[PDB]
Design a protein. Structure first.
Lengths: 249, 249
């Protein structure tokens, strides 16, 4: 017995009106018969189009980032802005952002807290590098990530949180990650939550696999005990995302 | 005589749907009797609502930032995405991006270069901080900034560039630079431009003032030989933006 799965599509910084419109269309067609939460996370610029055009009852929209308050932050987009706009979902603290845009754990932690406080469903990202992994530092890092986030949350706040574990060590590196390696990590996050936050929170918590997933492997990855869905990059700009959703039962 | 002035609104990370509709209705209501190019830079999230609703022939819509190419940059927007969406103007290198989000002169220069390659009209922000001004270093700072941009740009490119001079210490503080401070700063930029690029280019270039511009101060700032207009933060969220516009006459 698992919680409700989530098939999240992180379109990242990609797409055109034309190409996206098409994909939206493929999606609304999809017959999904089980309890799953489909999430399409578009660029800020594509939100409106996606909003109007996505009609499927299992699909909800997410933004790929946000700052906490409004004000003088040229080029940024805030939680109030998003909330007014009718977005209740958010990806926070992705790998690409921690790398290229200076997202310390504490910045992420703060963002998650702000979001949770504004009523969003947060897909908060954690995950270690090839360097970190290699040097025997996996658990230390992942637990620190989750702990930093954990601090600012009250127990009741966990209902608003989804964790996506990203194997950074396996992305762009050459390395392969097996379903047992996903699961090793997944189970260690849940361990942590169970232990510090509580078994009841633990049981309900969605831990999405945030690494390389496609139509071929998603069923297998899904087979694992602590894999509750996916945060999809590549395969999300594609028709196979539909197999990704199916693979969640 | 002078080049065609610009009056740009930098809404920054601010706004509500209804609030912006309102300004836009006002803006559409306004009869701009003189040749001025009016710009509205709204958040990414509102580019749709701005583009669809903003009717006035003297107004363009602009983005507050972008990255050069599309790819795996979760949270970010690229030039190609903006170009696709019918946005042809961009504000780049803003003080708040340089400060908070580590945008170096290198980064700005690269962004600008790419933006002009892709056929955008670019408002490039340059300006010293309080510390530098008090240290006597303003000259060095502004030139280094302008020269960085210059490196990446060949002659013709200049046609699509607009230079915004915004002293950090005047950004939403109340400390509007005097007309004398602005005019000496603006002249310096132009004397560097004529020297390095060409006199032909220097007379064509627009150089804008930004930092604590309101309806009151605007007319005098504008009277200075080398002041081609304004980049307005705060007063752009108000009906006084209109006053600032009429000030470029
Ligand atoms: O930084 C800007 O672009 C304008 C700052 P102000 O709000 O003082 O006009």
């Amino acid at each position: 017995s698992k919680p409700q799965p989530i098939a999240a599509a992180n379109w990242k910084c990609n797409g055109s009106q034309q190409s996206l419109s098409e994909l939206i269309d493929l999606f609304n067609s999809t017959s999904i018969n089980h309890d799953v939460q489909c999430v399409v996370a578009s660029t800020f610029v594509h939100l409106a189009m996606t909003k109007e055009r996505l009609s499927h009852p299992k699909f909800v929209i997410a933004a790929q980032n946000a700052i906490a308050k409004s004000g003088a932050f040229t080029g940024e987009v805030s939680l109030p802005i998003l909330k007014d706009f009718g977005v209740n979902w958010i990806v926070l603290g992705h790998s690409e952002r921690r790398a290229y845009y200076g997202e310390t754990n504490e910045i992420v932690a703060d963002k998650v807290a702000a979001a949770v406080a504004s009523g969003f469903m947060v897909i908060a990202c954690i995950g270690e590098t090839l360097q970190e992994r290699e040097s025997g530092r996996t658990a230390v890092v992942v637990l620190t990530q989750i702990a930093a986030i954990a601090k600012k949350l009250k127990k009741a706040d966990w209902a608003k949180v989804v964790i996506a574990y990203e194997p950074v060590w396996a992305i762009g590196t050459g390395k392969v990650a097996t379903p047992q390696q996903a699961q090793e990590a997944h189970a260690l996050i849940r361990s942590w939550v169970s232990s510090k936050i509580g078994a009841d929170v633990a049981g309900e918590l969605r831990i999405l696999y945030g690494g390389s997933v496609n139509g071929k492997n998603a069923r297998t990855l899904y087979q694992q005990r602590d894999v509750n869905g996916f945060l999809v990059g590549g395969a999300s700009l594609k028709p196979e995302f539909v197999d990704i959703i199916k693979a969640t039962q």
